[PDB]
Design an enzyme around this catalytic site. Structure first.
Site: not given
Lengths: 291, 291, 291, 291
Positions: D134, D162, D164
């Site tokens: 992440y 992930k 972001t």
């Protein structure tokens, strides 16, 4: 012999934004009359970046005429262009300036190697005159690490560094690794703390209207009167908070206008006018300054 | 009465990474015998964000049993959560700490109003103990402006600010706007410069192994001996240079193990061990400092 | 009608770093031979900031004489100074350029209002001709907010925005805010995703060696064939990855050289020379592109 | 089997800030009713960093009870502490999750090697479940480089990333280097562009109230219909524009509350309540969302 308190000379302009020769000579004389040790000409404070090489060459000349001999002279020759910077360096020696100075070339991203060549080429054209590396990350976008500084300041020909950074850890690290390097404190807001960290002098925009205060800070710290040093610095920052609100350059000029030094306190566009609402405070500052 | 030089207490762990009580008591006594004005516990340096509320509270209790009465005790009760910070704050009051402190809540972005409410709630649970607002942009990701600081430090119950920022312009501004506020310099590498700009004391992690130098820099600046202040500061910075390369917490802990204070110099995961290649320098420093 | 794909024109230099008039014209036609919609001349890619107003004016004329009528012509007139930008604006009108463009004045920090007056003045001197606002934070250091961009693009005379920002949420916001505004995607590496986010065109430096690919990306999307739009983008990026390692500008001029368009792939100082090691790879590229 | 559109599950609380079990289950069922591919629980959006490990394990169990088998289940087990992260990774395997995930440790700066061991240890305790790295620079303060991404993504046991980040250049560079890697687009505001750049699917908080739109964007692109793909993205951004103004989690919860899915739209302190002035738009939105 070039360590000390040097004012970052402003470039007076007339109503049409052209050089106000009469005001320039007056400001130079004024700076000398305050007991400043020298003038750093053609820098950021002089609005050099919205000036042509010719105009910048001109300023160097007039100021050399009015000051050569009286005080120390350092010519900021920097430009993004190496060639242009070399061009002004030549004028610097030709007009008898004691030193040459160049801001790290901005806008375009340049490697450490390219920055060195840039300084070498300039030093070359300075033909003898020592180089003052100019580090001002907030306006240039070039955040030099301790190591890159080392590389640049150990370049044959470099005799000083104008540290316009508020990182005083780096300020002492630089002094510690280069005990024989001339360290100018760039931010007036932290002069007192800059000297304490390792700087042995300073070059500032606000010296133009109160250089004697910074000289006072050097005396007090030299004399061990820390109390007065803080007293003075506090007073300098009260002035700096104001100048930051009104716009530093235009604020400084406006103050010099009320002091009878600058005819027209204008800057060149995109720089806008001083807010009418600010003239009372500036005039007042000018009033008390004449102390 | 919170003004002074406080060591940001480290948290000793055993081989299994559990609290090493004996080393904790040892470390606290070491700091006191060192002449520190007090201890700031459960802070960043204490690896609090890698501990449970339970573990952090146990540390507060131990340290209180060993130092209450002897030196000043500030408890860092700050968590991202307001509710967790309150719990720790009640534990602080219950164990007799002199004050509480809390980092500006991080990770998730919060507004100025939300930080104020966070501090109000903690201050409330602190039941009397003054609050120390803790500003540390580099770690929190929360860059406070002069304005926001003003609002946080003027909150009822707030009695000081731990300023771990290298912006000494802001440091003096904070001092000018809040003459009575206890201002702790946060970056050891700039202690001297910090004090001069307005700091009236400081809190640092390297105070664990050489706090006497900081007290030394304080006396020097008091006796107007700038010479000694600088000498002491650059010595400290030579140490910080090394610790910054080895890893501050682990490094300081290794030096302490060498000074026979900490049984095992480990930090908790994800923090790794000190690089083998660094042990010589740390051993020499221990040796050097012990005398 | 300013809509479409426009190559950001490089200005070829000879061995003495002077403008290579022959190679300039040669490059212009090559771009046309590629089916480019127009040329963005005198911009960052044009090494404009390492040229004099005279040299920039001259390039404008050359290019015009070669393309006026054949394709769309935008003239980057941006300078820190407003007066210099105004001067280059008149030259744009004088040589029959379709539109003017100007980077947000940099280095010195300016207020939104100052930036506004700056654009108005240039729009004025453009004697008509739509203004293309140029936002490139990474080089100018000016981080425009959606609100600020709003103020600038609604300024009378502005017809386009060159968005060299990787923020694709802002891109679509700009589009949603100004459905009648021409939006040029600035970073070639995200062209496809850029048009999808709301850009209806794009201006790039790599267009000079593969503008047909970007033209194909536009077609693939207009035809609802993402699969090939991606393959093309991937290809473009394979190239850009290389150009980044070698130095975008110098790398491009080198590839153009291997394509017999430019005599000497030299950028002006402080831009250094291409790495001897990266030569073969650049050759293979020039080889493949020719198909 | 981890490709797809996963909603970042919120964590419903009662008036006393305690976990609201009845509401958590409804939100689960509600997401499933929306045709979501799976749920990402215990992440930022889940307010995990203001919860205890105990509380996060309780949320893991309940969600599993409500969805194991129904849809994919990813458990965000990340904490700054490696030990705590492992403890939660064990609950994940223990409760039937299909995968584990951990945000890059934040606050304290860690080395790449330190980050690598953190994951290895999580993966080890995950007992078989693959790991979803992440990366969320904005909240964590950890801006991984393409290189560090490679080192982390290639670790054994790592099945996805992930992302972001709004950097769509890096997104494509990651797809290119790791074709067999699951790439979750992290910013809902750029979902369409992220996928085009290379994203495999996505994880987001706004999926909670409008997952179907995102599923729409996916099908639209899979069907070469870029026209409706933008329309959908524009609609989502209008919602996101609002959610950001009001506070994303609190806004989503308020809308969900007006949709009768959760009892109390409260977020835990320091998160404040939604500004009363915003409730009108939030109720209006919930109306149309229900249609």
């Amino acid at each position: 012999n070039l360590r000390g308190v040097m004012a970052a000379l402003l470039t007076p302009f007339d109503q049409q934004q052209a050089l106000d020769k009469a005001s320039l000579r007056r400001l130079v004389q004024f700076n000398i009359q305050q007991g400043i040790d020298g003038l750093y000409v053609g820098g950021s404070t002089g609005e050099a970046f919205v000036q042509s090489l010719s105009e910048r060459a001109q300023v160097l000349e007039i100021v050399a005429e009015e000051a050569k001999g009286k005080i120390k002279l350092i010519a900021h020759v920097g430009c993004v262009s190496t060639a242009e910077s070399q061009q002004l360096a030549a004028s610097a020696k030709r007009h008898g300036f004691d030193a040459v100075s160049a801001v790290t070339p901005f806008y375009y991203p340049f490697s450490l190697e390219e920055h060195c060549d840039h300084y070498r080429a300039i030093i070359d054209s300075a033909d003898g005159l020592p180089m003052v590396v100019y580090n001002i990350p907030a306006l240039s976008g070039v955040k030099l690490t301790l190591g890159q500084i080392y590389t640049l300041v150990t370049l044959p020909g470099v005799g000083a560094l104008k540290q316009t950074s508020g990182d005083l850890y780096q300020m002492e690290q630089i002094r510690r690794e280069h005990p024989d390097l001339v360290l100018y404190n760039g931010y007036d807001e932290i002069f007192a703390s800059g000297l304490l960290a390792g700087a042995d002098g300073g070059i500032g925009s606000t010296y133009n209207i109160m250089g004697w205060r910074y000289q006072g800070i050097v005396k007090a710290l030299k004399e061990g009167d820390i109390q007065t040093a803080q007293k003075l610095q506090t007073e300098c920052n009260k002035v700096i908070d104001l100048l930051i609100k009104t716009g530093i350059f235009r604020g400084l000029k406006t103050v010099l206008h009320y002091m009878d030094v600058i005819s027209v306190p204008l800057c060149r566009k995109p720089f806008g006018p001083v807010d009418e609402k600010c003239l009372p405070e500036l005039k007042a500052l000018a009033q008390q300054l004449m102390q």
